[model samples]
Target: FVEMVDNLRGKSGQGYYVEMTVGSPPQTLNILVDTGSSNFAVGAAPHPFLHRYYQRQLSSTYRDLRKGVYVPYTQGKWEGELGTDLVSIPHGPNVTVRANIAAITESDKFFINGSNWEGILGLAYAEIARPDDSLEPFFDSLVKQTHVPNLFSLQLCGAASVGGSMIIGGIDHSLYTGSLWYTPIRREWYYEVIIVRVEINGQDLKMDCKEYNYDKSIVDSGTTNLRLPKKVFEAAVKSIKAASSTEKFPDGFWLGEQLVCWQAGTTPWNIFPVISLYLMGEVTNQSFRITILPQQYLRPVDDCYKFAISQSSTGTVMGAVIMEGFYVVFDRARKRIGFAVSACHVHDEFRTAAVEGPFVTLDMEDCGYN
Candidate 1:
């Protein structure tokens, strides 16, 4: 059984696509990727907030499918419709897939933040499933009918030209080139890891340290920023300044200048420290070469200090900044997560990576929240 299970890792499964059509002659829009969740909302023309960022189109082919479908979240709700259409993905040649396209009409308290993403395609394991034994995730549905594995992986590259690729059913061999370091996955909607320690220049710094010391910190790829305790944040800023000899930005670290931009003659003393996360006995060190942010990328925000703190909240969130140029895999069956250095030519992979720290197993029952 173990041998059979090991052999199944890189196999392919059936995939789904979300499609949309609009305007008179009927223009088609199809997006072929999603991390998980349910919603095929796209930025529409004449939208109050998102109009400026996207090119709004008037298509007779476009139908308001989100007219009655209701989707709810932790904070609010959204009402939209769904439609079936043909779409293409950029993995080799365009593959046509059937998809439920959502057209949002009514939103609750939380309005969709229209920024880089026009909309989202939610396809979590639960969303495509039914409540009964006969029901399963959309991927499961495809697998059950086809006798293939319902496994998928996502490699989110940074804003680099090569970017990253999304793999469904199986992984693309050319994308990864090393043995995978697998970590066990907690059985829950999200896998949460206890933040044992956050070190800046080898110094442990974190606020509400007791909470994270015992509490489970969730790892979410959907979120782009890291959240941590205030003290940990202060340590990060201090470390950044120590390395750059620059004052805190009026808004936050994300908006501040890179350590490289600091003038050596001005402060004459700046040494960038390696920010490391000690998790499950492993020291994942993030050196100055990887953590520095460019000044031009900093966006203006009120209370710059608060923004800086927000950047590293949740004790230590491994956001997109640190996730770049890496191949991360979550193996639910084996209860393990894996990571490999991505060969994107952007940065060198941490050659000395290893799980050398003490390990602990947690139960949700201990946390009272469950």
Candidate 2:
């Protein structure tokens, strides 16, 4: 099993990054590890060269499948090229995992193609990989053609200010505590599962299974913050803003156009109620809940922390901000993902075994899902 710990360094850093040697004799290209978007830029956009470019001509192993790629988004669209190459990632001092790297091609998304990272290394399914939606993800390439395990686990150092690893093909049990809370992947296109309800304290936010009609939600590590349905997020923030109103902003006010933030003057963790999100289990037909502390959601924005945004009407998203404290496992073999409190946070484990589906549910509760 290939294991690599990702580098996370600050609150502003959106996602984890890994260093890759692309061309033969290899040029080091830093890439963003994303489970949300599928497209590898190899460091260059479709336009003239900028701070970085894939420099495909310099690489001996680069293959232009001659396939043009596209990624549709709410803001606009990203366009690029599709192809494969012999890529290498560090596994040991001299040992490395080499595979046919299928990735995001020539494109826009300046932050990705331009500066911070060479390009996005999408870990999600290939359904959203391109305009043609035919590209296979990087992980898929490894599992099928390389010696890597079919597992992808993340130990997120949230607030993005430390070392975290994206363990490919195996798990770093040292990072997580207790047992891994396993949940079945309800949708293959994304690391998705059924979100049964979103509750604040004990108050239900009208997200009971029946009302929304669709319960599938994405667990996206690429996103910096969680996004709720426009309507649901609005109401949820209203509660938080009011409840978290402090001496800094006693009346509560929007720090950003659609959000409100408060200074974490003193100890606010004990002040705000923990947010609990429930997910439906596919096998046992049970629902399990994951709790997010106030510190997890209410993040500092230049000393003034802001609440999560609810700007999405398309679906719900659990971004990196809330994922920090949990140990998440992406098990493609089982078509499921697992979550657990991190060993960094607590030091306990459960010996629970799987009852079905190569899955192991945390020995917590089985509410018999919707």
Candidate 3:
């Protein structure tokens, strides 16, 4: 809808917040919006008084299924009471949709003591859902309950601010330039696609995809930077070290751990060959892609530049840092996902404002983008 995405900057760094009202007479809550999770639960933050909680007694329509839901994050696990309610979404218009929700009973110290938001809303497809007949996400519920389509578009590229909109049931083509490349979805749990190869500069990063490819890679908005496969990550790190090792990247030095930092230079966004993700086509074996520009890839820290962690790991935890400059769409109707060059970096709404709008992001160092 036409709701503003709130950026919560605290000791934990910048995290994306979304507004939602639950129960009868509607009590508002600020939720850390995430696409990497599925269950909607709250009030378990180890810290108290920093957020609001769902008082089920206040809502007239509250229905308690009285079942325990286990929410697992990279941090730990959150146990809660699961239930349902009539959710009013800011769908450009206030739209009523019934949804499965939860009230946290227990969680980690980070969420309980250090967080500011009341709860979280997981926009990914339903995986924890108990019944095959009941497998549905909030957006999917909208399509089934209301006249809306099975889709939602994320325009989270606010440069000056972590501001953007998540329009359910529709897309604003104006937010992106050129055509939206439609690609097929390989899995239902996450937005998994068949990526041919990771093309950097003008060449494809050499690696054996015999184990890792686009299908093994996931597009997670709830994450940051790149969570690439081991071989690919190795190739990427080697290339980045070579490119920025010279004079053009002076002051380009390691801040600490894995972070490689430098001052923003006069180099244009196009000077660097585009980093492309060649996705597989359904009808033909053809490959279509979305490229990342320099300005979008490089970001500013306290002193200067910080390169994204293209870690040498064997995982599927892809984050927002990789797609900050692109307009992404989660299309459930045709079981497909779409991406286009974002208009944000060029000044429509936000800039390189990728996901969280997320967890904090550098060092040869270990970090988390979730």
Candidate 4:
């Protein structure tokens, strides 16, 4: 009895969003699906960025936990009070689970103008959940209260595309092709994985694999770009430059500050190199490689284009740019993350990415230990 929610929508600035009905009378709200952080938060108070908010006063099922929740991210932060209410996805699982929610009263740049999502559905573990770690995340509660297995799958149709899905409880076999290659979930927090290396045009970065997981490498759908540490970013830029035909470009272009444009019908895809990341697989001494074409990494910004890779003080964040390539399974039940070629990974007859591997591990050194 697995349930599939195929109503996920994607936007340019915002990631994927789905409809979730909360409370007794059932007020439906658009929720951004984020796998990076935990803490299901919604706009509960009046804010200029949001058109509507969750009016808890009007709901008979809302129960304030009397605890304050403040979650800070690299981009924005929000302050709220923890509450519990019956929540059910409109096209998701059938059972209504009493879930922990952060009813946001104030936010700073967290909710953006012209965004389709009004709230955030954090799908990660409770380690990073605010106020306290004991609170169960929305997906966890869903699995706990229902008869489904403790696993879910996510398929993002890339930025600027729509009709993606986050299938709860089980995998939709038709959504992906070939076999599913798995990588061990290094930690319960953030779906951490051990990145073996970064590659450009089939050439490895040649750095210590430990650097790839300096802080913690993770697969995050919330982040808009493929964020890398300063060292890794610099190396990637160098590799991309060496691999591409054009050796020189605007400094701001690489920094994501300026956009590069061509004629209306022209694209620079042929001049760029495909980027790949190798992740430690579940099998002993094996790794899996996920590659994204230039079309996936160099994103269209209005009439122009911008690099989708950015520098982060934190470790690597395999955001939507990377996840758009595959049907990602958060197999919490088996303590592994599965990747399969997504049927929707194609656009206009061209595939945007590739998932290959079970390549023999490059080095025996425990890359994730550091």
Candidate 5:
């Protein structure tokens, strides 16, 4: 069972401590809940770059085994391997979960950047499955093995700061205030949706655009950024700039310093319009916040900008930040995406509710699963 605990150092971002067994004794690893990508990895001992940070954890038993495994990235790689170890989460019991724990060593690729992060526990639905195996994700394994709902919930506390609880296996209903909004998924396997239209301040911005191919939009809870195509990005920037007076930055137009900045003071642009994405005929409104960055923050140098127009070779991506304060449901069995507005305030409760259909199985006669 998972139990909630106060974060260490009163850090705004919170994590869970899961219990794992290495060799014979149990040890605990504090893992950040990441939905953007899949892969459950931890910082190990002797990390040439991240070792100093890991040492601050003061865990005497942490091990460093950089010579035993291989971790490849799109640009570089890290050498490491799977090791059996004991692990635990605070307020949560111990579970024997296999993971790729990283070790400190001198290498071009195997160094952890000094972010407020020590390691990552990717909870994306895709990462839950074993490589070349049919077994589902670790959380799914817990649900199926324990005869529980394969649903997870996250309650991110506060409006500006980040502090949240991610409940695996099932959701805690007491944390929410109202019913969940449910929508149907358009495809199987992935959380694909049909974007019927997009609106800004109740104006139809996507009136003349091409219909979104349901196959392209994926609903991922891991990412905290909203990724869109160049067309969409340009349209959004244009609409926002037309409505407000933004200082032209080298990168992009500066919206404001914070949400309150627009509320309290009047600028060339007075109204901070509400941006909405219409999916399957329903409109999902997104909140806008203020940010301050170097004038170069908006500059587009080379083919990249502060935000990538399109990163992956395939298509654009949308992250979880777009779904903040919204209830989302992913039903792989039915192949549908469901959404609802959340009623509870941040940090008060951790809950999720929605219904989706199963994934549609495709035949291998034409194209094999890639």
Candidate 6:
């Protein structure tokens, strides 16, 4: 059986989260749905920033494994104690599973002051789990206990207060439109894939596909923006500037050190270009293209706007800025990922993302060679 959970926009308006009930007495908390990491952790101790925390002492089924867990992310880090408890997803398969959990005792910049999410539930593989791979993740336990297909899909509806949804164990055809295109999972640790190349306004960047995957690439829902490797980001910035006729923008704007604003009721869409990525598809000699319009990349943060693209030191990361425009599938059962246009991808009846083609590729041997 498939289970669907509606996501709530975090207080920061950038991260999306869902409600999960944990413990014997069932303490429900808003948990961030992160596809980049693998550790189900919650605020067990009080912090000045958190509104509430999971009261471990109150749950009779709680068992402390007495191990320490310290996790670090691009934005924050946390230290906690390892434990196990009775966990069930209210909006997921109606079954309780004994799951490994991290009870966070302290953190630095991990829990934002105004954020509403009380914990983080990572959806990646156990290879990246804190301490070691021996720790079973929440989804592994759920699949083992209920005997459901080991697959899940995600649909993020941008920053619209209505939020997004996550499907556990199976696909929901109604959440996305058009045919789903599959991409082989190059690596299990982070759902890594091979990127063929990047395009701006339908024009190829003219770089070797190897450059796109120079470091590696993955689709991550937890991150707030689309991140490019240092080399790709540099080329993109130059191309964007050359393609636009708008007034010159501050250098800081491209560096994410400053925001660009306009008069009320006006947008900079007409001045920006569409960004697209070509991923190596499951079919030989074919590639899948996913495109994002200005609305998804030039994000609106309250009144001002920030470029939803950033520079990454490690590898290319397709984050919420691109994920919000399409329905993404983590088909572990088949060792492949899928993408299709999301039903909620339209904002106020306008499109924000596009999914197209298992197009015959031009550079198969040189581009996607493993």
lDDT of 2 by residue, 1-370 (tens): 3245544333353566666667675767667777876655554444453445566677787787886655656665556666667666654123333433434444444453323455567778877766545566667767777666688787777542545667777777777766566677866787777665667765767644533313346888888776766666676777766565553343334333333433444444544556766665545545566766665665555145555544565567777766776878888899888877765431113221111222233421222233
Report residue 38 deviation for candidate 4 (angstroms).
1.0
Model 5 regions more than 4 Å off: 5-24, 48-71, 76-79, 83-88, 91-112, 125-136, 158-161, 184-191, 207-215, 246-270, 281-316, 327-338, 343-370
Candidate 4 has an lDDT of 0.83
The candidate that wins on TM-score is 4
lDDT of 1 by residue, 35-106 (tens): 334344543444564432212234334344333456677788755555533333323222334344455555
Which scores greater on TM-score, model 4 or model 6? 4
Better of 4 and 5 by TM-score: 4
Per-residue C-alpha lDDT of model 6 across residues 1-370, encoded as one tens digit per residue = 2346464455334488888888889998888988988899999998988888998899989999989988876778899999999987777766788899899998998887777789988889998998899888888888888877899889888753547888888888888989798888887888888888689989999988877875778888888888888888888888887777567778888877788888876665666778888888888888888888777777776257777788887788888888888899999988899999888774423445677887788764465434
Q: In model 3, where do residues sit more than 4 Å from their true spots? A: 1-14, 44-46, 91-93, 109-116, 128-135, 158-161, 247-273, 312-314, 346-370
Clashing pairs in 6: none
* Candidate 6 or 3, higher lDDT: 6
User: How good is model 2 by TM-score?
Assistant: 0.80
lDDT of 5 by residue, 1-370 (tens): 2364223211221322222322233434445555444445566565544422233134344444333544455777644344323344444323444333443232445333543444555555543322312323344444444543455555443232344555444445544455443444544434555444556655766543332331266665444445555566567667755654444433322332212122222322223345555444222331111111111112122132233222232223444344444534443334444444433332212222222222231221111112
Q: Number of clashes in model 3? A: 24
Residue 314 of model 3: what lDDT?
39
Cα lDDT of all candidates, in order? Answer: 0.40, 0.60, 0.59, 0.83, 0.40, 0.81
Off by over 4 Å in 1: 1-67, 70-77, 82-100, 106-118, 123-148, 160-162, 176-179, 191-194, 206-210, 213-216, 238-251, 254-270, 280-317, 348-370
* Candidate 4 per-residue C-alpha lDDT over 1-370 given as tens digits, one digit per residue, 9 for 90 to 100: 2346467986765788889988989888999988988889999988987878888888899998898888777788899988899999878877798999889998898998888778999999999877667988998888888886898899887646566788888889888888788988988988998888778878888988888887888999898888888899999988886676464678898888888887786665666887888888777788888888876677787257788888987888988877877899999999999998787774433435667887898563468756
Mark the 10 consecutive residues where model 4 has the least summed lDDT: 345-354
Q: Which stretch of 10 consecutive residues in model 5 shows the poorest summed lDDT?
A: 287-296
Better of 3 and 4 by lDDT: 4
Write down the TM-score of every candidate: 0.58, 0.80, 0.80, 0.93, 0.61, 0.92
